[PDB]
Amino acid sequence: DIQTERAYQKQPTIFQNKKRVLLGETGKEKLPRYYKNIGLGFKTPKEAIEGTYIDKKCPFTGNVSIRGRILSGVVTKMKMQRTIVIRRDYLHYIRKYNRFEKRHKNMSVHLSPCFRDVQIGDIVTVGECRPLSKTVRFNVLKVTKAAGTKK
Amino acid sequence: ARGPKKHLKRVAAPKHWMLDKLTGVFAPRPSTGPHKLRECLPLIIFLRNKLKYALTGDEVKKICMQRFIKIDGKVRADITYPAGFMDVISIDKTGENFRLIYDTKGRFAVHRITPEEAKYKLCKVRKIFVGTKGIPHLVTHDARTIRYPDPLIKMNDTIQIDLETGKITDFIKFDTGNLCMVTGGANLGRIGVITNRERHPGSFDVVHVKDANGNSFATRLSNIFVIGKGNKPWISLPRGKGIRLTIAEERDKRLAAKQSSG
Amino acid sequence: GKCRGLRTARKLRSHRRDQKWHDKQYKKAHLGTALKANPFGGASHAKGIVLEKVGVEAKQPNSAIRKCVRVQLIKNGKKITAFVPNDGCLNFIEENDEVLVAGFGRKGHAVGDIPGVRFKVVKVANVSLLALYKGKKERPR
Amino acid sequence: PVARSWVCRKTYVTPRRPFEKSRLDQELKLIGEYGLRNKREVWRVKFTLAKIRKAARELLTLDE
RNA sequence: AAACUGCGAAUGGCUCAUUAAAUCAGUUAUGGUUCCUUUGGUCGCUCGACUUGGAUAACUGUGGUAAUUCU
RNA sequence: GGCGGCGACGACCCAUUCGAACGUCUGCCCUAUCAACUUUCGAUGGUAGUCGCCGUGCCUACCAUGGUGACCACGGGUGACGGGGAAUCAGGGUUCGAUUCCGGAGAGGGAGCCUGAGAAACGGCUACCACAUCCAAGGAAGGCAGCAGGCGCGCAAAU
RNA sequence: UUAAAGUUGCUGCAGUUAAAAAGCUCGUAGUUGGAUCUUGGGAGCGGCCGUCCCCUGCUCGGCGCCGGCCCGAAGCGUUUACUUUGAAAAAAUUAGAGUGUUCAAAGCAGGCCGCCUGGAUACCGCAGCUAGGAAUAAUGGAAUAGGACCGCGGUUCUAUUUUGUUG
C-alpha cells in the first residue's frame, strides 16, 4: 500500500532504526508517529495519529505551518491526486445599482489522505500556507459532510 | 528604486513632525537608529522648532558638534538622530533636561524635568531571547540588549534603567490595575488603567483601557506602554495629565482663558 | 427599470451598456472610424495652403453665390473646401499661401444655405482676417 | 517639485439666465444704492451668502 | 596641490513607450530569506613579537601615434 | 623595566533601523463580426533532485490526464501607467487623472555582464541593427524621455 | 466634455396607432418564489403608558463567612447576509475650528510687559479583523430509527503518590 515510487518515504523527525536489546518481538515493529497541534482551536483527528501514510505537505504530519487567513468552500472536483479544488461563492456590491451580484472564484487546495471520507459537495475549511505548488497555497483543516448521505 | 531611499519630501513627512508647507521641498530624513522613521523625532526638528535655539540648518550643526548635547548619557554628533519615546535629553551648561512624552493630542511636547528624574528612563521590553552559553537576553523597544535580567520580566513588562550603569533597578508587571498609556494610532497620550485584555489566537490581542474620569477606549497589544503600578505614575506627567478633553470642553476652556486674560 | 431584483445588477449593467452603445453621439464619440474619416483628426484648428479660389451657389430659397476657397490640409493632405468668411476678403487671400482654417460651428456639418462646406478661414499668412478687415494691421508682401 | 501653493478658488458665480428684466433691475438697484463698481461684487456676496445658507441647511438637516 | 587607500555615485531629476488581475489600492504573512550605515550586546570563554615580507603610486628621466579624461 | 584615562578605525556573530523581494483575500475600459482555450516547445498535480538568499514545473528524470470557461475563460482593441484626486452636480450620476505626494517601467530597441550590501546600472562595460562625428584612411570616439538651447513635428508651450 | 437630457431612465423613459412584443410553444444556465417557530408578564418612578432591571449549560478560584452559599475565571457553547459600536486605515487636497496676511485668494501664524499658546475634528467607497439583537431572506437536525437520556454488561493502549532501602 505504501512505498510506491523510486525513493523511500519517511518522516525526518524520528529515527526508525533504533537498536533494541533483542531485535525480536514484544516491543518492536510499532514505529512512532510524528504529529503536532496546528492550533487556532482545531483538533487533530485520529487518522493522523494511527495512520500509515507519509506526506511532506500535510498540516498535521508534515513540515508546513498554518498562519494567515482561514477560509471555507465547497468541494467541486476530485480528479488530480492529493489535492482538490473548492468553490467560494460570494456577493459583490455595486454603488450605482444598489443590487448585489454573486461571483465564484474556484481555486486549488491540498487534501491529505487523512481526510478520505470526502465526496462532492462537502463543506471544508482551509488555512493559508507557504506555496506548495504553482497554484496551491492552502491546506484543509477539517471536513464537514453535506445534507443527506446517511449511509 | 534600485536601493534604499536617502531623501524625504516635506509633505511626505509624518504629521507629528509638525512642520509647514511653504518653507522647503525636502524634510529631514533621520539616520537609522533605535526608533522607526514615522515614530521618532530628529534633533534638528526639536532644536529648530520647539526650543527655538537655532534658526537655520547650520546653527543646529554647530550646536550639535560643539559637544553641548548629551543623549541618554552619551554625546551625539548627528543632527538627524532619531529621538523617540522617553528619550532623555540633557543640556549640561544651562542645566535643563527634557523628557519626551506624548501630550493630550497626537504630537510631542516640551517637558522640563529635574536632573534627579533625568538619571533613569522607563522603557518597554519587546522579546525574550536565550544567548549562546545559556544567557537569557532582553530586547528593549529602543534596541537595548541587556544581559542577565530579572527572572520575573515577561514579554510586555516595563523596566527602569539607570542611564549610568545600564542595569535594571525596578520593574512593573503587566496586569490589570496598572497605569498605562498608548503609543500610536487614533489614541495617543491618553493615560488610563488596564481593565480587560481579550485574547484572539492568530491575530492582534486588543485590550480595554479606562480613563481616570470615566472614558474608555480599546487599543491593540503593540500599542501599549505601562507607566505605573496603580494610580501613582513613575514619571512626571505633562500638563493636563493626559485626559483627552473633547472639543466642547476645549472650547469652553479657551473661552475662559480668553475672558480671564483680557 | 423593468427587471427589479435584489441580486440583479450584472443584467442591468450589461443592458445599459448595450443600449448606451446603440446610440448616435456615444457611438460617434467612441469609435475610431469617425476620427479616421475626420479631416482635422479631432482638432480645433488646422493649417493649409491654397490650391485655388472657386465659387459655389446657395440653396433653393436664398439666391447668392458664396465664394469658398480650396485648401488642402498639412497634417495628412486631405483636400477640403473652406469658406472665406466675411465680405471682400477674397482679395486678401492669394493662391499658394498659408492659411489657418477652423470649423464653422456645427461639430462638422454644413451651416445654412452653403452646400457641403463646413470650415472657415481665420488667418492668412499668419495675420488675422479681422485685422485686415477693421484697418488695424497690414499684411506683409 | 518646486515648493509653491497651487491653491486657489473662485469667489463668485454667474447666473444661468443672462438677460432677465427683474434680475438686472435688482442688481442695478443694489449697485446704484451702495456705490459698487460692477456686478462681480454682488455676485460674490451672493456666492458667500449661498455658502453660509448651504452650511446652515446642512447643519439643520442633521439631528438634534 | 599631487597620488595611493576607503566611501558615494543604485540617491536626486525627466518621461508615460510597454503593461487590462499584469501595475496599483486596502488587509495580511516571512514559523519560507538577505540587509550598507546607525543603536545595543559579544570581542583573556578556544589548551595549542620592544613589530615580519616584497611590489606599486606620486616623483625623476626618456618615447610613439594626425588624434582621446590614450599610455 | 613593568602599570594607567578619554577617543578614532576595523572585525565573526546576534537583535534592531532603512528597507527590498516572494506570497494570501477583494476590487480594473470596450468587444461575440473572438465560444471554447492550454496540453511530451509545462498546460494541472505527485515523487526525488539542480539552481536560487529562501517556498515553487523556476528547471530536470518518471508518473496520472488533468486546469479555466456563458457568474464571459480565451482572443483583439485602447486616443490605457495605477492610486490619493479634478470638473460639473437637488437626490443618483457622467467625464478626466501625461502633470509636483506614493508605487511601478525605461534611458534607440532587444541581449549579456564586472564591481558593489544594494544595478541586468546606461552622465558603467561588451557585440547587433537604425542613425551618426573626426581622420595622414591605418583607426579612434558617442547616445539631453537631466538643466539651458536648436531642428523636425505641429492649433499648441519660456532664459 | 458636464449640467440642462425624465433625449440611457437603478432613483427615473418608452413598445395599439408617433422609433419599437421574437409567428408560436417546450426548455438549461440566470432572476424571483405562499402560510407557519416565545406570546405575554412582575419589582416601581410621572399619572394605563415615551425612558429602568428580570424570564445558553458545565474544570480552577477573591469582595465576603461558619467540610456547607454567592461573585469570577485556563477552556467549549448552530452557522450566514443585514444592522450598531471598536481597532487600524500616509500627507496635501474636500468640509471645517482658531488667527485683522491693511480685506480676499493665501499662510500656519501670533498676543500681552521674559510670559501665554495654536498647529483640532469629520470624511476615507468596498474587502479583511472584532463585540450587544435575531425581526427580515436561505440552508440542517430523527422516518430503514446507525433518534436523544439513564444507570449496567464485554474487547485495548498509557500516567508515579504507595504493597519495609534497593532488582
mmCIF file with all atom_site columns, C-alpha atoms (C1' of nucleotides) in Angstrom, chain B residues 11 15 18 20-22 38 105 107 185-187 200 218 220 254, chain G residues 86-88 90-93 107-108 117-121 129-130:
data_model
loop_
_atom_site.group_PDB
_atom_site.id
_atom_site.type_symbol
_atom_site.label_atom_id
_atom_site.label_alt_id
_atom_site.label_comp_id
_atom_site.label_asym_id
_atom_site.label_entity_id
_atom_site.label_seq_id
_atom_site.pdbx_PDB_ins_code
_atom_site.Cartn_x
_atom_site.Cartn_y
_atom_site.Cartn_z
_atom_site.occupancy
_atom_site.B_iso_or_equiv
_atom_site.pdbx_formal_charge
_atom_site.auth_seq_id
_atom_site.auth_comp_id
_atom_site.auth_asym_id
_atom_site.auth_atom_id
_atom_site.pdbx_PDB_model_num
ATOM 1  C CA    . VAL B 1 11  ? 4.593   66.683 2.513  1.00 0.00 ? 11  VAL B CA    1
ATOM 2  C CA    . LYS B 1 15  ? 2.140   64.837 10.739 1.00 0.00 ? 15  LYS B CA    1
ATOM 3  C CA    . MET B 1 18  ? 4.630   69.137 12.910 1.00 0.00 ? 18  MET B CA    1
ATOM 4  C CA    . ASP B 1 20  ? 4.894   73.701 7.460  1.00 0.00 ? 20  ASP B CA    1
ATOM 5  C CA    . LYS B 1 21  ? 4.476   73.631 3.674  1.00 0.00 ? 21  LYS B CA    1
ATOM 6  C CA    . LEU B 1 22  ? 5.948   76.781 2.085  1.00 0.00 ? 22  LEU B CA    1
ATOM 7  C CA    . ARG B 1 38  ? 7.450   57.530 11.461 1.00 0.00 ? 38  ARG B CA    1
ATOM 8  C CA    . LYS B 1 105 ? -3.094  65.400 21.335 1.00 0.00 ? 105 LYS B CA    1
ATOM 9  C CA    . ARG B 1 107 ? 2.287   65.103 18.992 1.00 0.00 ? 107 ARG B CA    1
ATOM 10 C CA    . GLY B 1 185 ? -2.920  55.167 16.445 1.00 0.00 ? 185 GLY B CA    1
ATOM 11 C CA    . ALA B 1 186 ? -6.028  57.272 16.879 1.00 0.00 ? 186 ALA B CA    1
ATOM 12 C CA    . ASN B 1 187 ? -5.483  57.322 20.645 1.00 0.00 ? 187 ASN B CA    1
ATOM 13 C CA    . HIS B 1 200 ? -7.520  36.286 19.860 1.00 0.00 ? 200 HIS B CA    1
ATOM 14 C CA    . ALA B 1 218 ? -9.703  49.916 23.070 1.00 0.00 ? 218 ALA B CA    1
ATOM 15 C CA    . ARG B 1 220 ? -4.015  46.757 20.297 1.00 0.00 ? 220 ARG B CA    1
ATOM 16 C CA    . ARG B 1 254 ? -10.123 78.503 25.682 1.00 0.00 ? 254 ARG B CA    1
ATOM 17 C "C1'" . G   G 2 86  ? -14.183 49.441 18.178 1.00 0.00 ? 86  G   G "C1'" 1
ATOM 18 C "C1'" . A   G 2 87  ? -9.197  48.896 16.109 1.00 0.00 ? 87  A   G "C1'" 1
ATOM 19 C "C1'" . A   G 2 88  ? -6.134  50.292 12.103 1.00 0.00 ? 88  A   G "C1'" 1
ATOM 20 C "C1'" . A   G 2 90  ? 0.057   58.368 4.813  1.00 0.00 ? 90  A   G "C1'" 1
ATOM 21 C "C1'" . A   G 2 91  ? 0.324   63.691 3.799  1.00 0.00 ? 91  A   G "C1'" 1
ATOM 22 C "C1'" . A   G 2 92  ? -1.571  67.532 0.621  1.00 0.00 ? 92  A   G "C1'" 1
ATOM 23 C "C1'" . U   G 2 93  ? -6.394  68.156 -1.215 1.00 0.00 ? 93  U   G "C1'" 1
ATOM 24 C "C1'" . G   G 2 107 ? -0.381  81.043 5.094  1.00 0.00 ? 107 G   G "C1'" 1
ATOM 25 C "C1'" . C   G 2 108 ? 0.052   78.292 9.972  1.00 0.00 ? 108 C   G "C1'" 1
ATOM 26 C "C1'" . U   G 2 117 ? -0.471  79.421 23.024 1.00 0.00 ? 117 U   G "C1'" 1
ATOM 27 C "C1'" . G   G 2 118 ? -2.498  77.029 18.432 1.00 0.00 ? 118 G   G "C1'" 1
ATOM 28 C "C1'" . G   G 2 119 ? -0.535  73.910 14.684 1.00 0.00 ? 119 G   G "C1'" 1
ATOM 29 C "C1'" . A   G 2 120 ? -8.012  70.360 16.207 1.00 0.00 ? 120 A   G "C1'" 1
ATOM 30 C "C1'" . U   G 2 121 ? -12.147 67.465 14.258 1.00 0.00 ? 121 U   G "C1'" 1
ATOM 31 C "C1'" . C   G 2 129 ? -10.432 41.644 11.997 1.00 0.00 ? 129 C   G "C1'" 1
ATOM 32 C "C1'" . U   G 2 130 ? -13.772 42.210 16.309 1.00 0.00 ? 130 U   G "C1'" 1
#
